[PDB]
Ligand binder design. Structure first.
Ligand SMILES: [Mg+2]
Ligand SMILES: [Mg+2]
Ligand SMILES: [Mg+2]
Ligand SMILES: [Mg+2]
Lengths: 136, 135
RNA sequence: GACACCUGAUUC
DNA sequence: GAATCAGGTGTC
């Protein structure tokens, strides 16, 4: 197949220091690389929770702007979680991990109370190389 | 913080896998205490492993209690486990490095030591003192 | 096995 | 920027 990148899109990726560890995420214009949104470093979180938050944040960003652009993520886990509207994270829940869980609860609440037209697509890393929203 | 009364070791190579050498130095002085003759074919991690054990033997025979610094997370673990886990092909071309690694492992399995093996915090203190010059 | 995210090094 | 040597966790 000649499946090609849809450039008119939003790509999200997570960046961390450790896992679990410090987690950040951002959404960029797939074509230009321009950062559209970002999250301040969360002291303790996992890669999957971060990828999940990033996609939902993207859904909210595009909906508010009445955009029909699809969202790309290379995380099969986060994509499934958003589809299920449930983040199945094993991260222990306590004072240290209270913030990331608070954000995850907020994202689930959002997914369960809003509809969206956005196609959530799996970034074909093997076919296209690293996703554009990567940190470096 | 940094413990200056210590021995620092590091590997150096040209290619990886490639030619490898290693050395130990007085962390404070910078004085070279030992330096291995270049080995034709080896890996960076095999070299870091040899360097630490060599340092261990060096301190052991002097009944020194000073610690050893290495910036190698891999080699520090191999030493704690008393087992190197290199993926390097084992044959006539790599016989020397493997002979040294086998002997270093055997040394660990035939001696006791008190020497604390510490991780050099490159992120905070800069490059290890036994570092090899660029190029 | 798969999709990810890292950690510490060695070099060219 | 490219390549290789090693150890580790989150999830499906
Ligand atoms: Mg990702
Ligand atoms: Mg990435
Ligand atoms: Mg080193
Ligand atoms: Mg060095």
């Amino acid at each position: 197949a000649k499946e090609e990148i849809i450039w008119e899109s939003l790509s999200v990726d997570v960046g961390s220091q450790g896992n679990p560890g410090i987690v950040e995420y951002k959404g960029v214009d797939t074509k230009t690389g321009e950062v559209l949104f970002e999250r301040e470093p969360i002291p303790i979180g996992t890669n999957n929770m971060g990828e999940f938050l990033a996609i939902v944040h993207g859904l909210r960003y595009l909906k508010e702007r009445n955009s029909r652009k699809p969202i790309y993520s290379n995380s099969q886990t986060a994509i499934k979680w958003v589809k299920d509207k449930k983040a199945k994270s094993t991260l222990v829940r306590n004072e240290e991990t209270a913030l990331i869980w608070k954000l995850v609860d907020e994202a689930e609440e959002w997914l369960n109370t809003h509809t969206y037209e956005t196609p959530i697509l799996k970034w074909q890393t093997d076919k296209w190389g690293e996703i554009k929203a990567d940190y470096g």
